[PDB]
Design a protein around this ligand. Structure first.
Ligand SMILES: CCCCC/C=C\C/C=C\CCCCCCCC(=O)O[C@H](COC(=O)CCCCCCCCCCCCCCC)COP(=O)([O-])OCC[N+](C)(C)C
Ligand SMILES: CCCCC/C=C\C/C=C\CCCCCCCC(=O)O[C@H](COC(=O)CCCCCCCCCCCCCCC)COP(=O)([O-])OCC[N+](C)(C)C
Ligand SMILES: O=P(O)(O)O[C@@H]1[C@@H](OP(=O)(O)O)[C@H](OP(=O)(O)OP(=O)(O)O)[C@@H](OP(=O)(O)O)[C@H](OP(=O)(O)OP(=O)(O)O)[C@@H]1OP(=O)(O)O
Ligand SMILES: O=P(O)(O)O[C@@H]1[C@@H](OP(=O)(O)O)[C@H](OP(=O)(O)OP(=O)(O)O)[C@@H](OP(=O)(O)O)[C@H](OP(=O)(O)OP(=O)(O)O)[C@@H]1OP(=O)(O)O
Ligand SMILES: O=P(O)(O)O[C@@H]1[C@@H](OP(=O)(O)O)[C@H](OP(=O)(O)OP(=O)(O)O)[C@@H](OP(=O)(O)O)[C@H](OP(=O)(O)OP(=O)(O)O)[C@@H]1OP(=O)(O)O
Ligand SMILES: O=P(O)(O)O[C@@H]1[C@@H](OP(=O)(O)O)[C@H](OP(=O)(O)OP(=O)(O)O)[C@@H](OP(=O)(O)O)[C@H](OP(=O)(O)OP(=O)(O)O)[C@@H]1OP(=O)(O)O
Ligand SMILES: CC(C)CCC[C@@H](C)[C@H]1CC[C@H]2[C@@H]3CC=C4C[C@@H](O)CC[C@]4(C)[C@H]3CC[C@]12C
Ligand SMILES: CC(C)CCC[C@@H](C)[C@H]1CC[C@H]2[C@@H]3CC=C4C[C@@H](O)CC[C@]4(C)[C@H]3CC[C@]12C
Lengths: 571, 574
């Protein structure tokens, strides 16, 4: 029933063009029916055209199946050779070979699903054509040609699957089929797997509680010793980033962007956007409860400062929970990625490391707020000393994410020796160092008149412009790939675009243009004392805008990486 | 991946014992493999016994399929005869055509159920024989499947497919003017039971409403503990309605999980029926509105708006949400509920089915809403002696209290007239009339308390005796007639019946205890609310007890539906 959406959802995105165009055939049949007036000869011509189109589709399917089968056979031969070499050598290598075998099994199951779905679509479309035309020739065509097509009559895929199972059981799992087929089953994949009902209910409950608590917080703030905005901005930004990341995952899944392969995640087990929404909602509930406790201070004995810490500490615990609960696999993966990023020069830079470093570049406000909290606790607990004065440590903390990205680019240059991309990106990140340093120098010299304060102000202005232009150009031309020379119809874009609307691309371009300058202004204001009066308000307003810009950027960067190997993270 | 769960979720509950015993075969195979130590002789003996059991199961499946096929052929013949008679005959005609269409749809659903039985049994046989082959490392299971299972009548007979095709053709040619799509829109049978989960958006909305309701309840409690109109008497009805809807959603979920076919019992459409998630959604939305109204009453942020507008609107919206003509919000279920309510409130003039009696019982458990409505009518009539609407009792109050009992009593009388079977209907009528007697005696005692008639103590004693009488009558009817417990055929389940659908017997014992306690509590609450009785703490007692009455009516719904599914306790089916 309603095979169109079934086909659309169960199609492998990377092979979309190689599947049968069920919607195209439906449109052809409906148009022929509408244009039907000579009637018999017209119907005969339409039948001939439909059969020719079906023959073309069948030939395309057959050739794709043949090439995929040949590739699978070659990969199986290489894997068998590797396994034989490993046996001749006789732990980590065994695990890597097992992962490779799992990937090969997933590819084989994907090919099997492709052929099964193609046959089902052929049968359904021919049945629909027979029903509409009131003729049985469609069934005859299906039986004569489709039923005997090599792609449908070839069981080599099944034999390869069985051989893979036997090899894995005998050699890798030590003769126990129970160990095999677990991690080697390929459960439902893509959008074809509905999210758990309990997960959706939890997501809804958390969003509802978050909304009501936000309404209560606004009402209290309108009707009602410690900087609350500074302390809680980091948590709010983290929750917003998690929610927008869930939206990013949903869009990637809907748009056919194979983010799983790009991020090097397990195709069989993946974190759905619903899980990200659930985590964001729970964290937002905790954040709102802490803020409400701060505003009201229900328990008099417990001091106010316990409420924020108790939240953030819990968050840290939630991230580092040793127990295998609450998304333990994803949490451990995130911990490993964070450790690799913060020790960037000593590890090979994959796509995930660079992406997370960029996210930290966008979320630097959290680190800056942590430094401000440390200063406030150390000194305040001259009034407002941490806010009226700046120092080198503040600038270094601001630049830490840019330092990580710059060192990652240097490591990539060392590994690949390709000057252009990595060195240009390194310069694009060092613009941040220059701008922050000059802003800090100007702020320091403003108090103690050096007679060169205006020189530093001008240098900061030019470096601000340079950094904004550099970042915007890199985002538009390299991260997003837009403004390409191959745009046949998609002006200012590339030749291939996956998202349905180009208006989204144009709006994203405009928002990136505005928000790159906005974020540069926010960094300049926060890292120094440029605007001691309204600096906090502007920074607080701009940080969510920076997160939104970083969300749109993730969308389009993942879309470019999937379409083109812009990051050069894959062979 | 796990055909045991898939089968259990796809077996038609009515034929639960007529399917291959996949779990029993699994347990047998595991036990045989566990005790394996000579060895080949034991393996051969186990194989012989296992295949004897498989042959017995195949024979049972074939017999059941033959009986169902014969019944289907007879039903199709009768339907064809009725259709031919209707065609030869050509407002009553439209109803006859609609009834014929519904009967054809029901027969097609039965045919699809039989086909699903066939497919599931074949797949289970194949999957269990493959498992036996893998466990015993032999290919004899496949040979047995091919030689016997693959040639059994149940698997080789295609009479069901031909009957389906003939039914489709006849419905399209003589009931839809040749429109095959229109016929198939009603004949098609989507997945039934737990086969198809509810929409993700529905679950998300249910969760959102639940969270908002919880937070708003917390806010209301905080406002009442820290921060002209009786708000308890104005919001108790709404709270009880929301609680009853939530417990009804729980009841639907439990019925679906336990296999109790309430769709057939309630005569609901099997191709499209409301799920428990939709009931939770409605309950959560109504609870959100109720909490918002109560918060507005507590705070009254806008001063120009009078506080009495806040409750009214809420309840008004509820009424509007129940009589909304547009086909927007659960319009099918809303119209069905409106028709059922109209039939119940006009019981003697309509045939009493399961739905009408069940809804009348729900009203009986929800009589507090009518009492609160009458109290508010009094308050707006007189109070707007200051508190004259809670210090004296009048006949109208007792009549409004007994209205649900009157409806059930008249339903029982109509059923007795229709069937002429005196025992059940008349005993139930007396059970409901005990309510009239108790309420009347309580009202008489309350009225005579003020004046020294010297007959107030006799009225008190009459109220006491009839209170115990009503409590015992209702409890005995619930335990022995509604739930079908304390039967004679129960040789294993003590104090229960021979067959129990719910997983745990402890549920039944706790339900019995709670039924006793909350039946006594319900009688006390009705006595207190109908008449003065306690003039100071009666309000709080009634407010506390009404949720308990709803909970008792929810447990009773569970067990009554279970008993109806098992046995024809209500005699609403042939
Ligand atoms: C000062 C630093 C601030 C903290 C650092 C910044 C952000 C942290 C949050 C998210 C970054 C990770 C986003 C990855 C997205 C990839 C696409 C995707 O959505 O794919 C998901 C990514 O899921 C993940 O692994 C992690 C997702 C995030 C879950 C949230 C964890 C708690 C967050 C709060 C941290 C509290 C810190 C306190 C504040 C200082 C695939 O999931 P899987 O189940 O295949 O996981 C991999 C399992 N294998 C490897 C076995 C297949
Ligand atoms: C004393 C004051 C009033 C007391 C309370 C009155 C009524 C509430 C009681 C019961 C509601 C019906 C429960 C269904 C039981 C059968 C099991 C089942 O779940 O069956 C459902 C029936 O769904 C329902 O009926 C609707 C469920 C209830 C929704 C509540 C609506 C809002 C009420 C507003 C409050 C009104 C009072 C105003 C305030 C003063 C299956 O749905 P379907 O789509 O298969 O329906 C059949 C439709 N075909 C036959 C055309 C396919
Ligand atoms: O009787 P109708 O008209 O209500 O349904 C018919 C038709 O719908 P129509 O009105 O033309 O649009 C098919 O397409 P559709 O709408 O679902 O949509 P899509 O174009 O695929 O998106 C439908 O599903 P499908 O064959 O395409 O998957 C199929 O149902 P059903 O018997 O279950 O088919 P089986 O799976 O059991 O073979 C019926 O085909 P016929 O048996 O050959 O008459
Ligand atoms: O399955 P592998 O062989 O590829 O890797 C598994 C291996 O860890 P490694 O990589 O070698 O360091 C196991 O440790 P090990 O060698 O002592 O023993 P084993 O012989 O495997 O039992 C570990 O504990 P365990 O679960 O198996 O008992 C398991 O954790 P995980 O399932 O997350 O956690 P749980 O929630 O299930 O507890 C890993 O599963 P994955 O990471 O999903 O692949
Ligand atoms: O676990 P593995 O990998 O070593 O072997 C599994 C495999 O058996 P296989 O080799 O074909 O005979 C499954 O068949 P499959 O989906 O590929 O499909 P096909 O029928 O071939 O198309 C079978 O599922 P199922 O379809 O019968 O439901 C599953 O049974 P299990 O989960 O118990 O579920 P149930 O018996 O309760 O249903 C077996 O697991 P275990 O029995 O636990 O060890
Ligand atoms: O339930 P029913 O079959 O007894 O009655 C149906 C009948 O109207 P009624 O309610 O009896 O007054 C249909 O038209 P009708 O009078 O010419 O009679 P027939 O039954 O064809 O003889 C009407 O079609 P429409 O114009 O809205 O599309 C449909 O409306 P609605 O519920 O919104 O359902 P939807 O079709 O939108 O899903 C009703 O429900 P259903 O057919 O189940 O759907
Ligand atoms: C601020 C002004 C100038 C522009 C604002 C444009 C915003 C609203 C645009 C920029 C990028 C857009 C997103 C780009 C891609 C997707 C994925 C798609 O599957 C759903 C819509 C979604 C999620 C878009 C929603 C709208 C969006 C977020
Ligand atoms: C505190 C005591 C007196 C109350 C009586 C015990 C309560 C907890 C018992 C009485 C009947 C029981 C229910 C009976 C049937 C079902 C259906 C099943 O699929 C899930 C559990 C569920 C929903 C039970 C939950 C527990 C329950 C509600």
């Amino acid at each position: 029933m309603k095979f169109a959406e079934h086909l659309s959802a169960h199609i492998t995105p990377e092979w979309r063009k190689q599947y049968i165009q069920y919607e195209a055939f439906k449109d052809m049949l409906y148009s022929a029916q509408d244009q039907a007036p000579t009637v018999k000869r017209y119907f005969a011509k339409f039948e001939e055209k439909f059969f020719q189109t079906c023959e073309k589709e069948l030939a395309k399917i057959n050739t794709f199946y043949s090439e995929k089968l040949a590739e699978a056979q070659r990969r199986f031969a290489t894997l068998q050779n590797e396994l034989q070499s490993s046996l001749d050598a006789q732990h980590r290598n065994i695990k890597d070979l097992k992962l490779a075998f799992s990937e090969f099994y997933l590819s084989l199951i994907l090919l099997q699903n492709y052929q099964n779905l193609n046959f089902t679509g052929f049968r359904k479309i021919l049945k629909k054509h027979d029903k509409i035309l009131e003729t049985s020739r469609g069934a005859d065509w299906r039986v004569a040609h489709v039923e005997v097509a090599p792609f449908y009559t070839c069981k080599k895929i099944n034999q390869l699957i069985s051989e893979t199972e036997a090899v894995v059981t005998n050699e890798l799992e030590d003769g126990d089929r129970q160990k095999a087929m677990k991690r080697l089953r390929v459960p439902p994949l893509g959008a074809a797997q509905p999210a758990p009902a309990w997960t959706t209910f939890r997501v809804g409950l958390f969003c509802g509680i978050f909304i009501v608590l936000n309404i209560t917080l606004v009402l209290a703030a309108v009707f009602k010793i410690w900087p609350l905005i500074r302390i809680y901005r980091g948590g709010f930004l983290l929750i917003e980033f998690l929610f927008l990341l869930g939206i990013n995952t949903y869009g990637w899944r809907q748009a056919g962007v194979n983010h799983v392969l790009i991020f090097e995640l397990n195709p069989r087990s993946n974190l759905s956007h619903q899980h990200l929404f659930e985590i964001a909602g729970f964290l937002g509930i905790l954040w709102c409860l802490s803020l409400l406790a701060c505003f009201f201070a229900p328990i008099s004995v417990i001091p106010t400062y316990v409420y924020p810490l108790a939240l953030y500490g819990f968050m840290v615990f939630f991230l580092i929970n040793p127990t295998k609960t609450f998304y333990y696999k994803s949490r451990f993966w995130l911990l490993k990625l964070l450790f690799r990023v913060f020790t960037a020069p000593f590890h090979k830079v994959g796509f995930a490391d660079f992406w997370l470093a960029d996210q930290l570049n966008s979320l630097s406000v959290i680190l800056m707020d942590l430094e401000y909290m440390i200063c406030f606790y150390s000194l305040e607990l001259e009034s407002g000393i941490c806010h009226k004065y700046t120092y080198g440590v503040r600038a270094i903390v601001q630049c830490i994410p840019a330092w990580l990205r710059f060192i990652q680019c240097l490591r990539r240059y060392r590994d690949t020796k390709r000057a252009f991309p990595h060195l240009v990106n390194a310069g694009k990140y060092s613009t941040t160092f220059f701008m922050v340093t000059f802003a800090a120098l100007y702020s320091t010299h403003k108090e103690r008149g050096h007679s060169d304060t205006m020189v530093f102000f001008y240098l900061w202005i030019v470096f601000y412009i340079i950094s904004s232009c550099y970042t915007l150009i890199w985002d538009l031309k390299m991260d997003w790939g837009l403004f390409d020379k191959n745009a046949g119809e998609n002006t200012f874009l590339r030749e291939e675009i996956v998202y349905p609307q180009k208006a989204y691309y144009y709006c994203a371009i405009i928002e990136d243009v505005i928000l790159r300058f906005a974020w540069t202004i926010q960094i300049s204001i926060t890292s120094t004392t440029l605007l001691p009066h309204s600096g906090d308000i502007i920074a607080t307003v701009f940080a969510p805008l920076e997160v939104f810009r970083r969300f749109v950027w993730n969308f389009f960067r993942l879309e470019n990486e999937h379409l083109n190997n812009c990051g050069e993270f894959r062979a």
